[PDB]
Amino acid sequence: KNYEVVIKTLGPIHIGSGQVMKKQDYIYDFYNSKVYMINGNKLVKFLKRKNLLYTYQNFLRYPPKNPRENGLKDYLDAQNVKQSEWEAFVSYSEKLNDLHLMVRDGQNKVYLPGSSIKGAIKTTLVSKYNNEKNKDIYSKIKVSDSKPIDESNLAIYQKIDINKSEKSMPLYRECIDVNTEIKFKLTIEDEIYSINEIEQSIQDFYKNYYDKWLVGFKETKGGRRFALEGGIPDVLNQNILFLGAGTGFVSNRKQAKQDSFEILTKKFRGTYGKMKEIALKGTTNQSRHTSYQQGMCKVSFQ
Amino acid sequence: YSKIKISGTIEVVTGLHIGGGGDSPVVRDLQTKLPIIPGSSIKGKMRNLLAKHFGLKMKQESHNQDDERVLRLFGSSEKGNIQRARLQISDAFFSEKTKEHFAQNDIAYTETKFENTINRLTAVANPRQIERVTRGSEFDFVFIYNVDEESQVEDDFENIEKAIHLLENDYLGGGGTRGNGRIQFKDTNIETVVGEYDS
Amino acid sequence: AHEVVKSNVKNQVLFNGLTTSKLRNLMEQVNRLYTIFIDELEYLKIKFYYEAGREKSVDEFLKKTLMFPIIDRVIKKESKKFFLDYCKYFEALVAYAKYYQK
Amino acid sequence: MTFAHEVVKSNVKNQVLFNGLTTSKLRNLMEQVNRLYTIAFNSNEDQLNEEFIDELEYLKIKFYYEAGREKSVDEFLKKTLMFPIIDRVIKKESKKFFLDYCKYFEALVAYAKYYQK
Amino acid sequence: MTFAHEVVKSNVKNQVLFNGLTTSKLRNLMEQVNRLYTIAFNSNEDQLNEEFIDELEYLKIKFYYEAGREKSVDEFLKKTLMFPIIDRVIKKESKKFFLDYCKYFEALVAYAKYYQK
């Protein structure tokens, strides 16, 4: 039939838009830890009310190559532009060589796509039913896109490679903040995979995920911090799933090893060939010193 | 003999792709270079959804014979019986205030979506593109009803009411399964234009 | 239009490795303006500076087409027809870039 | 002339046509050529107006776009000398030669359609 | 080659004709044939115009296109020796032979029209 689905973002969730911000349209405050996206239109018309557009253009055009002199905050400071005006020209901000933006809609609010949500749901169905003609039932399960996501739930996070020794990935990804509530609407054209069937499919997927992989990252400081803080021993009762990108590639052991070698050989071969002769994605905050793995969120139906 | 016009405005809520011209374009008027909702698509969603909401036998599906209510309300003349359409649906276009509102605010009419593909056992990323009609735009339609029998007008209007009811809760165009097409209706106006009918 | 793109094929690379995926946002800008204002052309100029900054090859592309003088003269002229003529030229450049590739 | 005739039989290999050319892959080109056909037919004089010259320029642009989009169309256009013919047509600026090109291209398409999977 | 005119009766199988040929599907061909029959008939000399030679080329083009669109037309054209006779008429370029082809083709059309579903 037709139902409304509520999503409780347990952790940072990202849906990559393919737009990678360069060294432009931000201010990175080392000293207060907020990055300020800038409205292009308003900023440039400011530049013209201050007739410095040729200066700004040349500053962009041949960067000083001095890393301390290769941002936008320094460009604005060199013209002594007032911080309140520097506050006048901020389109939006979040708490950085590159930054990855989510998809945005015709009014530049983030929404959750229909591709991602059935992406996770299909993955759950395929694993539980062992691909029982699940490609055919794809057409008989329909998910509406999300309602908009207002900014105040948007914040930037670094990619954390959570292994027995933690490592940072050099770039960041913007994410939805913790505990945001997001709704979409659900329609069923194949009654066989009922609402409870779908929920139990997701739950079984999660339990299998736990007893295969989530138990292995133990004895890592960030590991047991998140594993315990998220309450996954109880979460085995909860309907939890990873959405979008940034979740682990996995989302017997020997076959997993061979497959993972093959996939990483196909993926990262152009940069680090070491995969031929041989790791969790999460986020670590400075504010609370608490690590969250990217992707999981709670789903309940109605 | 009389005709009762039905006039109103449809609002798109999620993404919209009709893509009749199909790297993957959308239906558009060449006289305005602007997207449209062709009446054929609306007619098709109507016929399918209403037949499903009524009796849809496997034998009837095989023989393309449709239910008598649906058939009189939309016309078949395929079984050797005379059945002319009693309801005609037209094209639909942008309204003026939508044009203005997008002109002022620096908003486009199209959103191009990358759909990332991750392949099983290989996870090979080949991006794909699809075009969409911006949400928040509203289209203006006219439905023209032909009156042939003075009593069953009310029943046909009621069936059109469930028509719109279903269509609001379903998907129009392409990508209906994946989250594209959810539209709503507002400002419906009924006005007999020819004849002496009280509607 | 054709002359510049065919002659900027050096030894094989185009404008030192130009690929249309780098021109997506500019293409969207040109399409949006084609559907439709001086300030819009201003932010248009700015976005050529933006995308020409994102890659060095793009900066060389916009230089070897003399894009910046062309856009300045467009903004001076303020005539709708001549802006559409610019759109035609830009579309031609994009098409010929698409043809001559890896 | 009808080099189209023997060319189309020269491009039957092992079966693929121009490495898999199909009639659905030339719809846009056929539409554009048809519109230029009717516009030029409406014209009285043989001298081609500068606006029709710009139409020919955009037509050349569209051949190049489609040829960059797909490889089989590229091979078809390359071997059928479409690009040299269009260049010569633009050079000549004569309406009758443009109509002769129209007839040639129509013959090409007709042969390509008659030999299909 | 008159056996090619009375093959039409040898091709009444079981009931469809030429595997479902209808004269209705021959309309474009009939129109073009009538056009150039009139144009040739008004002509004085036996030597045809070179433009008329190009016209005959356009005839072959249209014949191939129609044979591509419909299979019954394809069988009709192929087995009745239409293509070789078209080429031959193009080869001699004499008016009287073109009229001879016209009479053969019209006889074909009328006799086929005698039998239709």
Tab-separated table of C-alpha atoms in Angstrom, chain A residues 263 266-267, chain B residues 116-127:
chain	number	residue	atom	x	y	z
A	263	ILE	CA	37.612	-4.932	-5.926
A	266	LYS	CA	40.094	-2.605	-9.735
A	267	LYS	CA	39.473	0.598	-7.740
B	116	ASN	CA	26.181	6.251	-9.395
B	117	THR	CA	26.319	2.551	-10.291
B	118	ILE	CA	28.050	0.079	-7.966
B	119	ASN	CA	28.320	-3.372	-9.519
B	120	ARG	CA	28.118	-6.605	-7.566
B	121	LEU	CA	31.409	-8.382	-6.899
B	122	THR	CA	33.206	-5.655	-8.873
B	123	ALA	CA	31.797	-2.271	-7.758
B	124	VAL	CA	32.739	-0.464	-10.971
B	125	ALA	CA	31.544	3.150	-10.889
B	126	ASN	CA	30.097	4.307	-14.212
B	127	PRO	CA	28.189	7.579	-13.744
